[PDB]
């Protein structure tokens, strides 16, 4: 094929990254994120990225989807920051919530320069790294969740 | 302000409003004119096909009749959705590996003829992946044209590994028309192509083992099904049920030397960096109407298993709503203010012209 003559000729470029970095500047949830070691959590609520209060971190509604940014010091330099970004998809989350959580994970990755490593965490399938984020007893699944942002077409 | 989402397939328009869970208008991407030598569009053309010749302005994802495509878009806005397009930011979609001029002209028409306030052209497979709740995976999208494979890692499509096959549902319909002649049936005209399309969608399936299935079909009538035609005649079909979609796996059935959809999926994965291949093999997402044949996911599982390393964990994801996954992913993304921030505005188009689409839409 002729990629260069095609509609994918500008994929993979610095220009693509630049445009997406700019878009990520328009989400208030990312301001201040990833500035120190710890865990930050947001829940998708009718398409919006909404902070979860620290006192609830580790409790997740089975009906909902979340973004969890774990900031830590890498082995290479104890004074710098690295990132794992997990998106957690409840067993009963709706398609709008999971799709928004996926897209906004990519956006937070863009905001942080690509550095976050992404992990998709479906309820019951959480990775070893996700299980290691919460202290003993800290990971709890709650019944229910917030309403879908979709309008149902009858 | 509500954005419109329009997934212009080769075969079907899927159109509606961002934030809805499904497209509110789904209709054939066709313009009909009198078969006896002014025009009709979509469902109404299909209804009166008895006296019309039907033409698809899109073939293999590429607009080949711009005047008729403008009729389709006008009908979508004014007659189906009943909206004024100058009031709605609009998300359109496209197959990958199209010539750049296709989206330049889409952009020009949307701004200069329909006066949309803003617009974006998205790659279909990327929308499907987000609809599935993933940022990494490999999408196999097959509609009425252009089967494509798009591997995506951390939300970015990997352009060097994208594959395209200009073999999809329309080619399968045409092949079913051809092989039904062996039974003595004659399906030839554009209206008859639409009947055969319906037979295909209702009765075809992918055999798990093609040669075994051929032998089963000769041993007894156990695989036969009947179908009532619009004139009331009842026909019978047998091994055509599975020979038709077998073409996806054996493109030589229609004289193409191409790799089939299993081997192309595998080849796309093998063009990606080795360390991400396990995640692609475990996340093969199917989208589009031509992935709806019963048996296709199991046949894909079998065929990719045969090509891949013997310990590779392989999973085919086949969402039940996958006829609409591209549209749904668009509905989700177009509900996000940061996604809309990237859209081309009317003022940007006025100042930059069609070239701007390649600098904003990824
Ligand atoms: N159940 C089915 N089995 C096989 N093919 C199907 C089925 N449903 C739809 N199709 C085929 O899928 C195509 C339409 O699917 P779609 O994804 O809307 O295509 P496009 O996006 O190219 O318009 C047509 O070729 C149609 O006949
Ligand atoms: Ca919910
Ligand atoms: Ca990253
Ligand atoms: Mg399509």
DSSP for B129-198, written as a single string: HHHTT-SSEEEEE-SSS-EEEEEEETTEE-GGG-EEES-SHHHHHHHHHHHHGGGT----SHHHHHHHHH
Phi then psi for residue B162, to 5 deg, are: -65, 135
Alpha-helical regions (H) of A25-147? 95-111, 128-131
Say how many CB pairs under 8 Å bridge A and B.
141
Can you tell me the distance from the alpha carbon of A80 to that of A82, in angstroms, rounded to the nearest whole number? Answer: 7
Name the residue with tokens 């055509």: B240
User: Residues 6 or more apart from B135 whose CB is under 8 A from it?
Assistant: A87, A102, A105, A106, A118, A120, B129, B152, B153, B154, B155
Can you tell me the distance from the alpha carbon of B152 to that of B257, in angstroms, rounded to the nearest whole number? Answer: 27
Which among A6, A16, A102 is the nearest to B362, CB-wise? A16
Name the residue with tokens 């979860």: A52
Nearest of B267, B292, B302 to residue B172 by alpha carbon: B292
Can you tell me the distance from the alpha carbon of B282 to that of B317, in angstroms, rounded to the nearest whole number? Answer: 9
The greatest distance separating any two alpha carbons of chain A, rounded to the nearest whole angstrom, comes to 56
Nearest of B150, B101, B169 to residue B271 by alpha carbon: B150
Name the residue with tokens 């026909």: B235
Count of Cβ atoms closer than 10 Å to residue A38 Cβ: 12
Can you tell me the distance from the alpha carbon of B17 to that of A101, in angstroms, rounded to the nearest whole number? Answer: 20
Q: Which of residues 140-169 of B touch A (CB under 8 A)?
A: 154-160, 162, 164
Ligand 1 centroid, distance to B12 Cα (angstroms)? 8
Q: Which residue in chain A is spatially nearest to B131 when comparing CA positions?
A: A99
Can you tell me the distance from the alpha carbon of A134 to that of B18, in angstroms, rounded to the nearest whole number? Answer: 36
Report residue A97 CA to chain centroid gap. Answer: 11
A74 is in an annotated binding site: no
Residue B24, chain A, CB below 8 Å: the answer is yes
B284 beta partners: B138, B316
Phi then psi for residue A138, to 5 deg, are: -75, -25
Task: Give the up-direction half-sphere exposure of residue B286: CA atoms within 13 A in the CB hemisphere.
Answer: 26
Nearest of B9, B44, B47, B5 to residue B29 by alpha carbon: B9
Scored b (16 or more CB within 10 A) or e, A106-124 reads bbbbbbbeeebebbbbbee
Can you tell me the distance from the alpha carbon of B32 to that of B9, in angstroms, rounded to the nearest whole number? Answer: 17
Pairing mode of beta strands A140-142, A59-61: parallel
Give the pair of three-digit tokens for residue B159: 């352009």
Can you tell me the distance from the alpha carbon of A126 to that of A84, in angstroms, rounded to the nearest whole number? Answer: 14
Ligand 1 centroid, distance to B144 Cα (angstroms)? 6
Tell me B101's DSSP state.
H
Can you tell me the distance from the alpha carbon of A17 to that of A7, in angstroms, rounded to the nearest whole number? Answer: 16
Nearest of B142, B95, B140, B320 to residue B245 by alpha carbon: B142
Report residue B137 CA to chain centroid gap. Answer: 18
Secondary structure (3-state) at B22: coil
> Are the beta carbons of A106 and A113 closer than 8 angstroms?
no
Which residue's CA is minimally distant from atom 12 of ligand 1?
B289
Whether residues A102 and B135 touch (CB distance < 8 A) is answered with yes
Candidates B25, B150, B330, B336, partner chain A, best to mutate (most A CBs within 10 A): B336
User: Residues 6 or more apart from A135 whose CB is under 8 A from it?
Assistant: A58
Can you tell me the distance from the alpha carbon of B123 to that of B13, in angstroms, rounded to the nearest whole number? Answer: 16
Report CA dihedral (A50, A56, A59, A61) to the nearest 10 degrees.
-40
Q: Tell me how far apart the terminal alpha carbons of chain B are, to the nearest angstrom.
A: 24
Can you tell me the distance from the alpha carbon of B106 to that of B317, in angstroms, rounded to the nearest whole number? Answer: 32
Nearest of B361, B357, B341, B337 to residue B349 by alpha carbon: B357
Whether residues A150 and B20 touch (CB distance < 8 A) is answered with yes
B77 beta partners: none
Secondary structure (3-state) at A60: strand
Can you tell me the distance from the alpha carbon of B185 to that of B162, in angstroms, rounded to the nearest whole number? Answer: 39
What is the DSSP annotation of B179-225?
Answer: HHGGGT----SHHHHHHHHHHHHHH----SSHHHHHHHHHH-STT-E
For B276-280, which contacts have Cβ atoms below 8 Å and span 24 or more sequence positions?
B276/B136, B276/B151, B276/B153, B278/B312, B278/B313, B279/B136, B279/B137, B279/B153, B280/B136, B280/B137, B280/B138, B280/B151
H or E element at residue B122: strand B118-123
Give the pair of three-digit tokens for residue B289: 């109407």
Report residue B161 CA to chain centroid gap. Answer: 19
Nearest of B281, B261, B260, B259 to residue B270 by alpha carbon: B281
**Which of chain A's residues have a Cβ under 8 Å away from the Cβ of B159?**
3, 8-9, 11-12
Nearest of B294, B267, B142, B141 to residue B208 by alpha carbon: B294
Tell me B10's DSSP state.
S
Count of Cβ atoms closer than 10 Å to residue B228 Cβ: 9
> Are the beta carbons of A68 and A87 closer than 8 angstroms?
yes
Can you tell me the distance from the alpha carbon of B217 to that of A103, in angstroms, rounded to the nearest whole number? Answer: 47
Which residue's CA is minimally distant from atom 10 of ligand 1?
B289
Tell me A6's DSSP state.
B
Task: Give the up-direction half-sphere exposure of residue B175: CA atoms within 13 A in the CB hemisphere.
Answer: 23
Give the pair of three-digit tokens for residue B201: 């969608």
Phi then psi for residue B145, to 5 deg, are: -140, 170
Secondary structure (3-state) at A141: strand
Which among B21, B336, B339 is the nearest to A152, CB-wise? B21
Can you tell me the distance from the alpha carbon of A124 to that of A143, in angstroms, rounded to the nearest whole number? Answer: 15
∠ Cα A31 A34 A35 (to 5°)? 85
Phi then psi for residue A103, to 5 deg, are: -60, -45
Can you tell me the distance from the alpha carbon of A77 to that of B254, in angstroms, rounded to the nearest whole number? Answer: 59
Ligand 4 centroid, distance to B2 Cα (angstroms)? 23
Name the residue with tokens 């996954």: B325
> Are the beta carbons of B96 and B61 closer than 8 angstroms?
no
User: Residues 6 or more apart from B38 whose CB is under 8 A from it?
Assistant: none
Which among B121, B135, B360 is the nearest to A19, CB-wise? B360
Task: Give the up-direction half-sphere exposure of residue B58: CA atoms within 13 A in the CB hemisphere.
Answer: 31
Task: Give the up-direction half-sphere exposure of residue B258: CA atoms within 13 A in the CB hemisphere.
Answer: 20
Domain annotation for chain B: domains and CATH numbers: 1-27+60-125+325-358 (3.30.420.40), 28-59 (2.30.36.70), 126-172+262-324 (3.30.420.40), 173-261 (3.90.640.10)
Report residue B205 CA to chain centroid gap. Answer: 18
Using CB distances shorter than 6 Å, the residues near ligand 1 are B 9-12, 143-145, 169-170, 197, 200-201, 204, 288-290, 292-293, 323
Ligand 4 centroid, distance to A99 Cα (angstroms)? 19
Report residue A4 CA to chain centroid gap. Answer: 33
Pairing mode of beta strands B90-94, B4-8: parallel
Count of Cβ atoms closer than 10 Å to residue B43 Cβ: 16
């Amino acid at each position: 094929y002729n990629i260069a003559d095609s509609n994918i000729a500008n994929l993979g470029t610095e220009l693509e990254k630049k445009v997406k970095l700019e878009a990520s500047q328009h989400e208030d949830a990312w301001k201040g994120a990833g500035k120190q070691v710890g865990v930050e959590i947001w829940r998708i609520q009718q398409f919006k990225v909404v902070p979860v209060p620290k006192k609830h971190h580790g409790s997740f509604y089975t009906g909902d989807s979340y973004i969890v940014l774990s900031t830590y010091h890498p082995k290479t330099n104890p004074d710098k920051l690295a990132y794992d970004v997990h998106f957690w998809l409840g067993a009963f989350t709706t398609q709008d919530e999971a799709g928004t959580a996926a897209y906004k994970t990519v956006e937070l990755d863009d905001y942080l320069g690509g550095l976050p490593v992404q992990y998709r965490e479906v309820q019951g399938y959480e990775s070893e790294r996700f299980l290691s984020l919460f202290p003993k007893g800290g990971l709890r699944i709650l019944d229910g969740g917030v309403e879908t942002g979709f309008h149902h077409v009858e | 302000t509500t954005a419109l989402v329009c997934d212009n397939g080769s075969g079907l328009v899927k159109a509606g409003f961002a934030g809805d869970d499904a497209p509110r208008a789904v209709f054939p991407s066709i313009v009909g004119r009198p078969r006896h030598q002014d025009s009709y569009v979509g469902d109404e053309a299909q209804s009166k096909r008895g006296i019309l010749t039907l033409k698809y302005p899109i073939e293999h994802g590429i607009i080949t009749n711009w005047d008729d495509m403008e009729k389709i878009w006008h009908h979508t806005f004014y007659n189906e959705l009943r909206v004024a397009p100058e009031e709605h930011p609009t998300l359109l979609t496209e197959a990958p590996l199209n010539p750049k001029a296709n989206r330049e002209k889409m952009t020009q028409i949307m701004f200069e003829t329909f006066n949309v306030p803003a617009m974006y052209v998205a790659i279909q497979a990327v929308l499907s992946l987000y609809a599935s709740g993933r940022t990494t995976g490999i999408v196999l999208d097959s509609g009425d044209g252009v089967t494509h494979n798009v591997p995506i890692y951390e939300g970015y499509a990997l352009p060097h590994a994208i594959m395209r096959l200009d073999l999809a549902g329309r080619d399968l319909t045409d092949y079913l028309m051809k092989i039904l002649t062996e039974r003595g049936y004659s399906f030839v005209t554009t209206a008859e192509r639409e009947i055969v399309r319906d037979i295909k969608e209702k009765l075809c399936y992918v055999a798990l083992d093609f040669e075994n299935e051929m032998a089963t079909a000769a041993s007894s009538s156990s695989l036969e099904k009947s179908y009532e035609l619009p004139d009331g005649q009842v026909i019978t079909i047998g091994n055509e049920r599975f020979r038709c979609p077998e073409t996806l796996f054996q493109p030589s059935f229609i004289g193409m030397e191409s790799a089939g959809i299993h081997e192309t999926t595998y080849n796309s994965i093998m063009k990606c960096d080795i360390d991400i291949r396990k995640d692609l093999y475990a996340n093969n997402v199917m989208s589009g109407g031509t992935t709806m044949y019963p048996g296709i996911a199991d046949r894909m599982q079998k065929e990719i298993t045969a090509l891949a390393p013997s310990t590779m964990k392989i999973k085919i994801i086949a969402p039940p709503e996958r006829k609409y996954s591209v549209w749904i992913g668009g509905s989700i993304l177009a509900s996000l203010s940061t996604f809309q921030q990237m859209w081309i505005t009317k003022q940007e188009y006025d100042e930059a012209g069609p070239s701007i689409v390649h600098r904003k839409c990824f």
